[PDB]
Symmetry: C2
Subunit: 222 residues, 2 copies
């Protein structure tokens, strides 16, 4: 267990193991953390129900929450103050539809954040993900700005700029990273999830408004 | 124990508990890690000898190493391939003399790195510290450049931009952070050390050439 001991989080954006957020999900569960999951709609319900039980432990809620509309979020986070009391972070992880692009998260964090505030009474972290222009820039500012607007209540906001991962020309991009990335290799759901367990942990209590690149060091290039 | 399990590191720049690097030091030991320590000279020898034994466990080497001259480094890292075999990281932490300013680390990392390469056969991390212009800029590039020059051998290079800590006008700066920093409060040797245990851990294996600010979110401001 340990590190995320007696702690519980929402994981959004999960759909089909291959998904980046199941990656994060496992990585948090193994740190001994409890976790609610959400689903975007009809077809994404069964998949998220299927995956939550391939994990052992007291199985946790799988409530419906598409992010582009209020009630589903508002009532979805309403339920938590009413069913689990309080949580310790949120894992804004929308990375679908045209490779996560336009496409989302950019205008789904603020609301998502605002809602998190009320069910995160002790503090913790609101992670959001960037899967490797205008919307990278907004979301960038949105974090900075949320970091500082929700600091004093104990909420940290932090991003992960995550580089390409095994089939989640293209065939070229992947090699290009095996060839240029400082670590000469692409990334995995796992490197991305283990970064997360830190940001959510007690070790990352001074790290707020940061943005950690899980990209083999690719960012340092041009 | 755990996280840094069966792992061992060099911690430089430690002098007088108050020192930032003893902070990092404890934070690594508690993660179950073995650690060599170095000292800048005559008076800094006894202090580093004194502190290494206030920590339990098989006590580890306290060899002499001032960083501005080769042999003391070269032979100091020579000893390791000859006495401990191999290590998993280095904690370049020079933060003394005029508040760590000019003043050092800027031209002590490269050599320090080069030497680390030979005693880090499996990989790991070379942390370097920035305790909150020209020398911040060099050191910044030095990392980027070392990150990418030592990537493929499994070495990650990473920095910590660390914000002011309790007495380590000034009286004003401290309040200014309690007042403006997103987390409305200054930092501790501890927030700085627990960040480190991550970068050195297996969780931070995709994080290379990053630079994590342990500054209550202060960096996001202007």
């Amino acid at each position: 267990m340990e590190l995320l001991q007696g702690k519980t989080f929402v994981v959004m954006g999960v759909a089909n193991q291959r998904s980046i957020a199941w990656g994060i999900a496992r990585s948090l569960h193994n740190a001994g953390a409890k976790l609610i999951f959400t689903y975007a709609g009809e077809r994404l319900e069964r998949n998220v129900r299927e995956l939550a039980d391939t994990l052992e432990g007291q199985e946790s809620l799988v409530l419906p929450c598409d992010v582009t509309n209020d009630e589903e979020l508002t009532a979805c986070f309403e339920t938590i103050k009413q069913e689990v009391g309080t949580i310790h972070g949120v894992a804004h992880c929308i990375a679908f539809a045209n490779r996560d692009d336009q496409n989302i998260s950019a205008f789904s964090l603020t609301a998502v954040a605002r809602e998190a505030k009320k069910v995160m009474t002790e503090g913790g972290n609101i992670l959001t993900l960037t899967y490797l222009g205008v919307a990278k820039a907004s979301l960038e500012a949105s974090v900075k700005y949320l970091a500082n607007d929700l600091g004093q209540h104990g909420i940290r906001v932090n991003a992960i700029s995550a580089g390409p991962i095994r089939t989640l020309d293209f065939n070229s991009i992947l090699r290009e990273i095996e060839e240029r990335a400082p670590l000469r290799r692409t990334t995995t759901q796992e490197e991305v999830g283990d970064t997360a367990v830190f940001l959510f942990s007690d070790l990352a209590r001074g790290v707020t408004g940061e943005n950690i690149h899980v990209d083999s060091g690719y960012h340092i290039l041009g």
